[PDB]
Write a protein that binds this DNA or RNA. Structure first.
Ligand SMILES: [Mg+2]
Ligand SMILES: [Mg+2]
Ligand SMILES: [Mg+2]
Ligand SMILES: [Mg+2]
Ligand SMILES: [Mg+2]
Ligand SMILES: [Mg+2]
Ligand SMILES: [Mg+2]
Ligand SMILES: [Mg+2]
Lengths: 110, 261, 109, 261, 109, 110
RNA sequence: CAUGUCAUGUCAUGAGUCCAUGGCAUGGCAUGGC
RNA sequence: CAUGUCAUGUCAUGAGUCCAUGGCAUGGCAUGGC
């Protein structure tokens, strides 16, 4: 069959962690300006954060915060506010996805 | 014909909820407390309990218009108890239908050696389910359904339980009636309680005795007052005994009989 | 600026962010399957029913749907990000306009 | 506007019965037990109690869809209690209207120094009266009437009672979240309960401490688990403290930090 | 025949029988008053209401009604009985036919 | 006013004692034949009942039992069975009383 | 929500009463159900 | 009908884990309401 129960729980947890992760990024992370300053002068920054500055995460967090200070959060904005807009009965996708492609996906399975 | 036809829950989401035990959802950490509460059946069980007691009360209240509050209460105790509704629940196979996070099978588990109150809860939860689904028209279907379930329980209870033993046809003046016919002050006519009602033996036994210890009667009832009356009624049914003591009193000088010694 | 306490959380959040999307894309089917379940719920197992009343399963389905198509957009660049990142390369590597980086620099002075 | 308009009992014989206390009829020896039971209000009080609890349950169940069973139960406790309904009864002057065989006045009497449960009973009995008179249409009038009476009681209860304090907005992972940021094995990061909930003080206070005794946070709640969480949330709000201990952990060799000593 | 136990009860029963009727006739009003109360029960005090649902008050009223008229019949002869009774007079003194006394004598042989 | 409460209780008790009294008479008392036998030969009867035989009650009980063995209990039969025939709503007298005299009693008060 | 068993107070009940039996209220103790 | 606090068992949770935190079940003790 489809949609095993054990997989549902993993999914629900994953989606929840996904949303919680992005929110904590936006909250804690400064923008690319603050990042670029710290990474350029590392003599000023606290010693403990040096190995962190050499890894991808902090930059990725700074850039996502940057897109957030701007517009074009795009999908990300939709996802965080998704919990609210969800109604027990809605058959509509609610995202930026074209419903025309929803049909082309339908017969593809068939 | 038996068991009675189970009232159906139309809403499929609700029908599923009554069978969801909290062990299933409460361990899911990504769920908010609110989302948990709307998941399991605990609210339905809570609601179902009040509904159960409500319609059971109405059933017996109407069926027994001359019953006291103590009798209506004692009777209801048999109908709404966890032990009773557990057995009804098993009867409908709620039972196996229940979704838990642990093994309902495996007799060596502590669960099987407990009171299985879990099986009672799902019965109340089912009732509560009917009330959320369609409160209006599923309510009378609950009465008509619980009436049928209660009938055999009511029959056995009103028969074999002392608390529910009919106290009419009893003579409340029987004790005084007896003293009138026979008793005088120096006779030392009295009542002793040989057995006081307990949980193990909810019976009372009282003997009607005279001064020298002769037992004129014995009685049994839900309590000392009822037993004592039956003891008086027991003595009052024996005419040869009464006529003996009635004559005996006449042979005593009014001088002597009015004292206690 | 840039406390140590903030930094250990940011590394864990970004990490968990990426793992989460990978697990979703892997596990979740698209809306076709989710719409199949939500429309007629009979055949669907009793245990999964409460999930259909929660947002998580639908959102998972829609993200897998966006993945079955193009327009993952930001989401794809995020997963691949770890491999593309380099220490001495000071480029942002994302889809954002480089001119907008200039104005934000001036703003925070 | 206040109090709410009292639902009227059409039947005059029934309206009289709710106000007849058993002391009036039970001392009349010429009456059969049955005739006594149909005389006083005890059956009406018994029935009225189940009705009261039934519609009160339905009221709060719907008004608070996210409330747990423990909260719905605790809230109902405030609505259906003898102490509460006694005060409503006095409000409607049931009170003086009651017919007893003894003095309701005369403060030197033992009655006035008791719990006056008699005044609670007449309220339930009045409800029960409405149900015998016209069961159909007096039932919704009971809901609409008891809704109005409950509103101020519900408002005060949900505010000032710890049991009813909203547990959402709380972070269930807060304790683990804290250990993640700071704690290591040799830190001996733990929680002590300084105050356990009692009847007199239904509050719990828990302190979050490290090995040397330094208190990182304090919390208060309906129980040790809730208080402990708030203590974690209390420590998590102070960034300078966290950043200190987070840095402190980094300065400890992984060799040393993984042990308990 | 004629036990002592039966005799002390019979004397008390007959005594109480007569006192009871006297008290009723004295205390009870007729049906006019009872029908006044039972028809419109508003003005009637709350305490007496349950009595109107019991047989005793009506029966009392009807017996007083029979007394306000003639046709107390048996009831009058019973009260006056104590005064009319004489030891050596073997007459029954009631309204019963003396011939019926003859047949009952023969029957019990 | 009319119908005092304290008087109602005395009445209800009196009516109850009246009915209970008559029933116990019928139950315990033999007929005038048995009475006439005992009162005529008092040498046979037990000594304790002698003063009782010289008083009005036993004779009165025997004669009421006699009317009961026969018909013409009249009012007495009605009174004992009165409790049964009583319905919460009946405006009819239920006795042997003429309802025509019920009217003549009505305006007499007026 | 009722039950059982006592103590005190108070009001009643009964026909040999210097006796006997109950109702209520208050306060204990205990039982049983939700 | 719920609550509080423990013991045992079992299943989970978390990011420095030889650590920390919870869910359930069973069994105590205690509280509160009808
Ligand atoms: Mg429950
Ligand atoms: Mg229950
Ligand atoms: Mg339950
Ligand atoms: Mg009561
Ligand atoms: Mg109550
Ligand atoms: Mg009550
Ligand atoms: Mg007591
Ligand atoms: Mg326990």
């Amino acid at each position: 069959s489809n949609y095993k129960y054990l997989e549902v729980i993993q999914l629900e947890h994953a989606v929840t962690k996904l949303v919680e992760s992005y929110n904590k990024i936006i909250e804690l992370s400064p923008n690319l300006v603050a990042y670029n300053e710290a990474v350029n002068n590392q003599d000023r920054v606290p010693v403990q954060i040096l190995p962190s500055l050499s890894r991808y995460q902090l930059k990725l967090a700074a850039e996502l915060k940057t897109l957030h200070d701007l517009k074009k959060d795009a999908i990300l904005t939709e996802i965080t506010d998704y919990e609210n807009e969800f109604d027990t009965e809605q058959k509509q996708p609610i995202l930026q996805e074209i419903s025309k492609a929803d049909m082309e996906k339908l017969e593809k399975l068939e | 014909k038996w068991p009675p036809k189970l009232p159906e829950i139309q809403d499929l989401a609700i029908r599923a909820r009554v069978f969801i035990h909290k062990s299933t959802i409460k361990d899911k950490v990504y769920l908010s407390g609110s989302e948990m509460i709307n998941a399991h059946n605990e609210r339905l069980e809570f609601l179902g309990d009040s509904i159960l007691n409500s319609v059971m009360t109405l059933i017996i209240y109407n069926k027994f218009p001359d019953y006291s509050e103590g009798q209506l209460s004692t009777l209801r105790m048999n109908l709404v108890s966890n032990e009773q509704i557990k057995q009804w629940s098993i009867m409908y196979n709620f039972h196996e239908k229940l979704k838990t996070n642990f093994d309902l099978k495996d007799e060596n588990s502590n669960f099987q050696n407990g009171k299985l109150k879990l099986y009672a809860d799902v019965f109340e939860a089912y009732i509560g389910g009917l009330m959320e689904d369609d409160p209006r028209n599923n309510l009378p279907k609950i009465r008509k359904w619980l009436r049928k379930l209660a009938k055999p329980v009511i029959e056995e209870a009103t028969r074999n339980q002392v608390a529910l033993e009919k106290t009419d046809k009893l003579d409340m003046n029987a004790k005084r009636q007896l003293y009138s016919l026979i008793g005088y002050a120096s006779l030392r006519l009295h009542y002793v309680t040989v057995k006081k009602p307990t949980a193990v033996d909810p019976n009372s036994i009282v003997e009607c005795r005279v001064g020298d210890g002769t037992v004129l009667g014995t009685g049994v009832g839900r309590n000392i007052k009822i037993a004592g009356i039956r003891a008086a009624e027991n003595a009052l049914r024996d005419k040869k005994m009464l006529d003996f003591y009635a004559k005996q009193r006449a042979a005593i000088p009014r001088s002597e009989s009015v004292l206690k010694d």
